[PDB]
Amino acid sequence: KISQYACQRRTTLNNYNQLFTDALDILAENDELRENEGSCLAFMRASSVLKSLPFPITSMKDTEGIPCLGDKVKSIIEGIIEDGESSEAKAVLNDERYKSFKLFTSVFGVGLKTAEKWFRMGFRTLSKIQSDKSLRFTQMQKAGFLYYEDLVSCVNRPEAEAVSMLVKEAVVTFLPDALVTMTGGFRRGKMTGHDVDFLITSPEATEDEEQQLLHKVTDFWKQQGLLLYCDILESTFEKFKQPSRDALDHFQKCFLILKLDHGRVHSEKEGKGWKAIRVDLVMCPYDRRAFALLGWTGSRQFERDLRRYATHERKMMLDNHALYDRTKRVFLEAESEEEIFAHLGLDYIEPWERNA
Ligand SMILES: O=C(/C=C(\O)C(=O)O)/C=C/c1cc(C(=O)c2cccc(F)c2)c[nH]1
């Protein structure tokens, strides 16, 4: 029996139902843009469960026994089986508000509120936004527009590996015992990504050393002329606080734009000779490295279902920093992701199987 939870499903990158899931992902994204959280969640769960199937849906009979497929979702699947297209997703793709929100938020520094503001001002293209003489842009948006073409082109694995080398070389200069791990989509086996994420931890660093590393590493890159953008968020995580029932609670992290020289990239394959890359660095205390790694590996849907399963099925509270057992009234310790899964009574799901 297919579980309703992504954390009890193996979801690999061989998606046999892209025709259905691309349409469901568009409809979910539109519901996010229309602030319809409930309809958004229903489409996300349906998309997720179809991504896990080991075969393609070719008839309505194939949907029997599959959870998270409500009547609205089954009408969409029926329409795609009919003529290979979703009329509903096609109408979203042609909607003026949807087109504008996708295009405007594709800029680094532009979220829902700024995209909505620009749309209500009558803007429809990035050229008209950038050349307007009345608009005021944040420092994040300025960087987003300046490096737009590089940031909108997919980061590939040779580029992610080139970035990993840069991160490791800079980090070990200040903390030689530090462990640097590439997380996110690339850890799940993806060929491309919009950014490259890293988790940094040190078994012997002090509380102060741990706090200063991201400042030292970014100052070093600034001196090197490689830091195109930098925003460091100080940690809000507390050693003895219960896990959330929240994006306001986090480890020390930074959102960066790095200058990646093409000479550093070892690929099979001209212009300026460098590429702007979005990089996120996360620093965590050594004892919480498994919780942080699990949280930063993703996918978004796998993380949501892990936390939901922990709460509803195990009466446990899971977060990027800890796992708390409400029945035993104790925090559960873990040195690996495997130990976290075992505490939750779940079979271990490999990172490449978390593409929910
Ligand atoms: O799959 C989803 C979302 C669904 O599950 C849903 O909305 O239902 C994307 C989640 C996601 C993206 C990332 C990255 O930041 C990332 C990407 C590439 C390389 C890299 F190093 C980091 C990690 N998790």
Swiss-Prot record:
Changing H321A: Nearly abolishes enzyme activity. Changing D319A: Nearly abolishes enzyme activity. Coiled coil: none annotated. Its cofactor is Mg(2+). It catalyses: DNA(n) + a 2'-deoxyribonucleoside 5'-triphosphate = DNA(n+1) + diphosphate. It comes from the Eukaryota. Residues 3-356 are annotated as: Mediates interaction with DNTTIP2. Changing K253A: Nearly abolishes enzyme activity. Residues 110-114 are annotated as: Involved in DNA binding. Isoform TDT-L: Expressed in the thymus, and, at lower levels, in the bone marrow. Detected in both cycling and noncycling pro-B and pre-B cells (at protein level). Isoform TDT-S: Expressed in both cycling and noncycling pro-B, but not pre-B, cells (at protein level). Not detected in mature peripheral or germinal center B cells. Interacts with PRP19 and DNTTIP1. Forms a ternary complex with DNTTIP2 and core histone. Released from this complex by PCNA. Interacts with TRERF1. Belongs to the DNA polymerase type-X family. This is DNA nucleotidylexotransferase. The gene is Dntt.
